Symmetry: D2
Subunit: 459 residues, 4 copies
């Protein structure tokens, strides 16, 4: 294929144009109380600019998401279900709210059910806990972080859940969660189709890491970066205030390190940036720290939680070793070994994970959540199922779950972002004597200029 990595429980070994076909629940009878279009996967041309229009490098076309002239489900007779799974994430309530109010205010659906604490709230034993989502209940939930429905990790019995959906007359079930959640949602889809029950299962991709394939952005990412940067600023001030001071700060990234990268660059306070895409040895790290301490009394280390997972697997995804705490103790033991050279020295660990997830979204992420939701509803009412909504090239597209779980995104280590990271982070490939000379040369040239202009300012 091209840019993407094969996921660990991939259902596809490649993606053909057929794989991108979005399952449509049979029928399209009722008019929207309010033809499918495509966009190219790759907008790069195959040839150089000749006489005729340009041609995509990739044969892949993606289905654009938008409110349909004809809808499949009958508005005033439909019941919408929502369930939030996994760890929390900025704007979870924003998705809940926009789904609720699009169903109520735009399609005028019969009712909206919010299932409590993830898939457990569709189990026979926790279907008792579900709640009614009227306007009054979601009025200001978007002003807050986490989820009013609550969440939980891991799966339930597909049969139990489809049982609860039928019993509550749920025509559309919106699965707000990560890879594992949407793979579960495909199981529910194939169970409800095994029974021939008219239910649409539709995924709203919840990943803060923004490692979603056929996606440039997922909701919560931008807010996560903003927060990460504020955590780095505190790590930096804590580290700078100490002689041979190290600040370790763990940012999100199991599979990607997009947060680690973008936050490192944006703060411009990152001296070392450890991401899963670029795995390096313990001694490689300590060597970068050693280099840094040649010329500065201060080092700041960004580490993605998915880095150095050799210094497993829960329910869907993978059990991480706490690389933050490991890396912290490794550095401490390295500095206690070279007390000779780095006499007084201090190492500070920061897990800002809680302040990053558990907060309302930036207005830009809030608007993005609102749009992702409203469109997901517009399409589920038009019989879309077994699919997610994502953002590519300024457009909203529908991706089959089977595809979206098969491939994942990952830093291009030859790309402009990672350039800008190496631009600011320690490079062993710089002679520190020669570099530091040419530095003070410029500093001196500049200060002598000011000296000259100040002499001039005497009457």
């Amino acid at each position: 294929t091209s840019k993407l990595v094969k996921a660990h429980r991939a259902m596809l070994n490649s993606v053909t144009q057929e794989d991108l076909k979005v399952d449509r629940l049979p029928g399209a009878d009722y008019p929207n109380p309010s033809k499918t279009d495509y966009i190219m996967y790759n907008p790069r041309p195959r040839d150089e600019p000749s006489s005729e229009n340009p041609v995509s490098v990739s044969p892949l076309l993606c289905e654009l998401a938008a409110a349909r002239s004809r809808i499949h489900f009958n508005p005033t007779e439909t019941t919408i279900g929502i369930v939030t799974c996994g760890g929390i994430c900025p704007g979870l309530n924003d998705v809940i709210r926009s789904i609720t109010l699009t169903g109520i205010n735009v399609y005028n659906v019969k009712r909206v059910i919010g299932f409590r604490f993830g898939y457990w709230g569709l189990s026979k034993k926790g279907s008792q806990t579900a709640i009614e989502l009227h306007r009054g209940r979601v009025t200001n939930i978007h002003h807050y972080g986490g989820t009013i429905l609550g969440s939980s990790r891991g799966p339930q019995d597909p049969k139990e859940m489809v049982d609860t959906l039928e019993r509550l007359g749920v025509n559309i079930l919106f699965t707000v969660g990560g890879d594992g959640t949407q793979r579960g949602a495909l199981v529910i889809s194939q169970e409800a189709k095994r029974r021939g029950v008219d239910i649409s299962v539709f995924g709203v991709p919840k990943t803060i890491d923004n490692d979603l394939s056929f996606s440039h952005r997922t909701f919560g990412f931008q807010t996560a970066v903003e927060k990460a940067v504020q955590a780095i600023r505190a790590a930096y001030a804590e580290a700078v205030s100490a002689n041979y001071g190290v600040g370790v700060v763990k940012l999100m990234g199991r599979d990607s390190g997009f947060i680690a990268a973008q936050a490192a660059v944006a703060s411009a306070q990152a001296n070392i940036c450890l991401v899963p895409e670029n795995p390096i040895s313990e001694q490689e790290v300590m060597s970068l720290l050693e280099r840094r301490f040649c010329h500065s009394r201060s080092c700041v280390i960004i580490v993605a939680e998915g880095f150095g997972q050799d210094w497993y697997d829960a329910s869907g995804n993978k059990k991480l070793i706490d690389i933050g705490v490991i890396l912290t103790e490794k550095v401490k033991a390295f500095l206690k070994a070279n007390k000779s050279r780095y006499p007084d020295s201090t190492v500070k660990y920061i897990d800002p994970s809680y302040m990053i997830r558990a907060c309302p979204p930036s207005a830009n992420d809030a608007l993005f959540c609102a749009t992702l939701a409203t469109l997901a509803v517009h399409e589920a009412m038009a019989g879309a199922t077994g699919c997610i909504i994502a953002m590519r090239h300024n457009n909203y597209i529908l991706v089959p779950i089977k595809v979206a779980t098969s491939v994942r995104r990952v830093l291009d280590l030859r790309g402009q972002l990672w350039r800008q990271v190496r631009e600011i982070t320690v490079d062993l490939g710089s002679d520190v004597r020669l570099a530091r000379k040419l530095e003070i040369r410029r500093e001196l040239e500049a200060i002598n200029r000011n000296r000259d202009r100040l002499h001039e300012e005497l009457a």
Copy 2:
């Protein structure tokens, strides 16, 4: 015929593929002390249905991708870079200054970087005296602050005077950070310096908060502007809600667009009326929407773009404010006690550092602008389209401008939350209290149950 408007002094009456060719200063001798031009389609939509072979763009237009080049035209250790910030301020102006400075110094190792004070006036013979050296030490933490250390000013100077100053200071590359007018001036400087046969690259960094730049989905400062706008709406709302028949008027940015007005209205979800230039309506149309709102609520919030109602360049905020006040003082009968609050948050929106996302965006826009100017790009701007960075000829970028698609999903989402006269108020208000009552009865039932 697509989603662009032809600009007021457009230099092109159409755009052909030739018009998109980016001027390259002759020669490409020196190697990038760091380390074929590539394209992306204008329109990524296919002409046909998904058939056997790969899909084909609806539009014949191809855009030049911006990236660090294997071969550069200018000699690093012999080059001098010039920067000038023009017009009104904007979030992350200092971020662009800093990243240009430090990319030139730290990545290309240029001889020196000159910052011209207060816009084009700082290249005039009479203000070239005020220009400053941009060493690392001078730009260290400027990105943490709003406005511009160089300072800015509106309007033009003598092209000859400015090229004179560029030659005298040995400026090989001049980075013009400003709006439409600035970049049109920058093309004048380009054509003057080429009339003299002087090896200077003039390169534009588009400064518009309104995000109305053609061949662009995003301009630096926009996201931060939205974030701030939303915080101003939240204060307008709390001020209006606290009053019986309370109106909050809040003026957001938008001379030509109303992208801020729209996105902020939707994101806050506190906008009852949203006035933008793209949708001009009468005074009575406004007062009718306010009247409708006051049928069911004691509270109205009005978003107005500074470029709206320019037939009532005129302070529509203060006009609209007095119009509403005079309308409510007429109709005291119906709206007895009533209060109207004007808010100009313009100052808190422009004059502030960027959000981390806009900071990263500024940094990238800059670093790439340098990577391309060193590779002999001139008479062009850098913009963001479809997740990619592209080089657009100034002649093109000034010929068309962006504008809200009133049939597009964003404006849908605005009408979704703002007063609609086209809704029967009796029928709507009924179906409202029906749901309210259903919900109340549910809670009632569960509370009755709570006898353990």
Copy 3:
């Protein structure tokens, strides 16, 4: 009488110890389901530290506010009323919430009524709009600015309002507003006592200007400063970006200029600071601006809304001062050729916002104590903060005097410290400046030379 100013319709010409006696509704029968103490007005000693303990300069003693062993009203039989009057203010909802929940959760009162849009919500035609304040209704109101009850300026008929209080069985009415509100609340108090009706009227002082007498702090002030400072930072960046750029920024202060002062000092970006306490001429201002433009291309002017109220034909001193400066710079185009003047009214972003956590805690405490005291039969009085202690002040007193910047005080020192001084010869000052600048840069030069091998 010394450091305070006499208010414009003061009910007292001085304050005696008797004037400070806080009206107690007769009876104290029921136990708190949960002796009055004093603090000195002035804690300064009359004499030196001699053999015996020190003695206050002032004879005045203030009643400390705290939960009483015995309360006057019967908890499960009491109804509490709240009304927010005037302009909004950070933490209005915080006061509403803490009063509500102290009455409910601590005293377990029968019910709590919130009267809509200020005194209008106690008028016969408006009492229909009042609302029930259960826990569920005030749960998260403190996260927001302005008032869920809503507010309105001006008075109503005292008789109409006492009529509504009796009809709704309101035993305690909490008046959240400024001077005018509490003077109205005393009228209601004296009307309800003219009828012999067992109602306690208790004031929670709402002033952002913090010009309340017998008070060092009022709720909303700290938050106001924080916001003011953020407005100055934008004014500054707007002004700096222009050649001969002026930023005018109007902060709160009708009678005081405490916000103007504290914000000027805290930002340290204020070049001129105009406050009502120090009224100066138009030409005095333009002279300070002129001085500033001798050495800098940038001036930032803090103006209190109550300054220069004699410049007009409150008058909008922000807009006046703005046009005056513009006309002065257009007159001296010769000297200040290109020049720009930017006005900023951040008034809306300052009032209409939730409180800083420190102001939220302060609101919570002001409220909870106001309830603890009203249940113990306190009436015709306000609660304020003096010298780290909470005290009860008779409204008659609190409306008679107001606070005001001490222009010889350390704060105003720190303002003059950073704002243009005409009393500096600019030639001699600017010399001694570049001397230090050069000394400093030569030092760095020396240390950089050292860093080479």
Copy 4:
């Protein structure tokens, strides 16, 4: 001892009026280049009721007010000022550095200002080499940032070495920005420099975020710390609420006090349990409060001061040697919930150490102004020959406290005071019942809602 606690190595067993006398360096020759000491009572509470004569303080103690003096002791244009920041960082450290610098330069026009790097180590022979010049240009915008440009370090140095460096650099005034350890060191330097008869003024700027300083209602950084704590609680709460039987443990500052824990708990109003050193309780007492909370809610938030429960797991450099009560309490709760899986089946426990986001940040504008004032006054008084003393804030006034006194006593939550009331008001009380008492509460909202229902039915018509 009456309201205050005796500190662990207190230099006084009581405070008399003589103990409050602020050491004045002999002489007061030069005029303040800027154009008789006043007192305030310790306790402003009267002994008797309001009778015929003026009221009399309960306490005989009078405190010296701090303010710019008509006559100063040191010669401005001939004086050198020294600054050193010690210990852990704190909001507005740079604000104190800046205001001291610029008051000395701009107001007194002192000869020079030296900033000693990384605490007392920067006065040691071996680190005196690292000290820096503090000109206007160097402190211009440092106040916009957290931590210290000078840098800091814990622990002591040789008093002789440090006085050696002070004499060699001609430092007339040394400003010690640190905690009570730092100021006790500063008294050692004071008594060493007086043993040599060297005209040096040692003046303390109290750096405690915990706000446990005696003869002080406020220390710089406190308000900002609260603000930040509250934002950490809000994230702890949202993380806990999103889980079925979800616990959020959040460690706030408080080695000796728990003022942050208390004020943050009350202000957030999201705290279900609040553990502070002043009120030590058993492991089972905690788990019992959690158990109670889980009877009625699926969500618990626990505020723990770092100085609480220091007997669940002596004394190295400073006061003690703290066990990580955050991590202990976290594992204890986890093991308790894993034991009662029966009752609390699915359950989640989240630990949060927001310590770094609280210290390492610039001050709130209110704390910035407070830092600026503390500094400018400290300079105004050191120039007027004040030494062996700190500046603090009491009853809206700035006072000078002898270090010997300030290190002898410390503040601590009054557990019968209105603040701690307001904490118990919102935190789990075992003295509400299972059902028979714990019942009367679930009323109100239902009674209210039928009224609104009725009026909404009416709005047909």
